[PDB]
């Protein structure tokens with residue numbers, strides 16, 4: 437965990453959200469894939485409510501681009517201050533913000549509503565009410581008296597659990613912890629790395645619990661979810677870059693039952 441104390445947002449963003457992985461022109465890439473899973477899921481209209489919490493946001497917003505048009509109160513979270521500050525820089529359109537415009541444009545492209553990407557960003561910024569500290573290892577990840585409306589109507593989390601858990605069992609308990617935040621009958625949208633064991637974020641070198649699709653499903657069942665959808669992206673050679681050893685990426689749409 438203390439390895440995270442050297443985690444550099446700019447290097448992480450650069451490693452995973454700038455080209456090649458961040459060049460969204462090719463439809464077969466990991467970015468378009470993640471965006472499509474999220475867009476398709478929200479477009480069903482079965483994932484809706486008023487409040488939504490993004491677990492372990494780090495310095496990234498793409499995971500909420502499609503979500504924002506379905507929830508008016510969105511809470512973002514992360515363990516590190518440096519990430520919350522990096523989010524703050526984009527939310528407030530401050531200087532040095534990361535350029536997500538490519539992801540915004542593609543989300544609009546995929547959603548097919550003819551929406552311009554400026555309106556999409558504008559709606560996301562407006563709907564993000566707060567950026568909170570969080571620790572998924574705590575049985576109450578947000579704390580005692582969090583400004584966050586609980587229980588949330590839906591959860592979104594991307595590349596968080598498997599990256600903060602030393603092994604399978606911890607991954608399972610972390611899921612249990614955040615699951616307490618989710619109202620019964622609510623929805624979790626979980627994106628994660630498959631069979632990955634490390635990734636780099638500048639000077640920091642983070643350990644990852646390698647998980648498989650079935651381990652992810654069993655763990656969702658165990659935590660009390662009905663798995664509505666579970667999908668896999670295999671990482672093409674051209675997007676394997678020396679910043680990690682990720683083998684694939686998974687997307688799960690789970691419902692608390």
Ligand SMILES: Nc1ncnc2c1ncn2[C@@H]1O[C@H](CSCC[C@H](N)C(=O)O)[C@@H](O)[C@H]1O
Pocket residue numbers: 440443491492493494495496499514515516519570571572573593594595596599600
């Ligand atoms: N104990 C913890 N609980 C919740 N988040 C944690 C955590 N320890 C580290 N994190 C955060 O986990 C994030 C993993 S990187 C994920 C960024 C974004 N969700 C994505 O789709 O890219 C980092 O921002 C990191 O600080």
Ligand SMILES: NC[C@H](O)c1ccc(O)c(O)c1
Pocket residue numbers: 452457466467595599629632634635680682
């Ligand atoms: N820890 C997450 C992992 O390093 C990762 C792999 C591929 C990605 O496209 C990504 O966003 C994150």
